[PDB]
């Protein structure tokens, strides 16, 4: 969990990594609004 060069070593299970490219980590994108929501009214009930 230190940093990407380290997390690479967490994959190949080697303290030495050959030069190249390595699919390393489970990247993700996040939501930032826990929105609770609804629609657009018109016709109310007359208890009058």
């Amino acid at each position: 969990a230190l940093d990407p060069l380290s997390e690479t070593k967490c994959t190949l299970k080697s303290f030495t990594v050959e030069k190249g490219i390595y699919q390393t980590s489970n990247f993700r994108v996040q939501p930032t609004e826990s929105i609770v929501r609804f629609p657009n009214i018109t016709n109310l009930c007359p208890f009058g």
Binding site: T11, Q23, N26, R28
Partner: protein, 48 residues
């Protein structure tokens, strides 16, 4: 003649568990499958 198919890649732990820490925890018992499963695709990927 064809030359190469689309370089598909999947991450098991996402595909197997769409971010459910309970799910991944059980999977880890299965060991190196979803390392090697990932690996072969990359082997497929690079070979393209």
């Amino acid at each position: 003649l064809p030359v190469s198919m689309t370089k598909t890649s999947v991450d098991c732990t996402m595909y197997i568990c769409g971010d459910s820490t309970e799910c991944s925890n059980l999977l880890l018992q299965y060991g190196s499958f979803c390392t090697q499963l990932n690996r072969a695709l990359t082997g497929i990927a690079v070979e393209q």
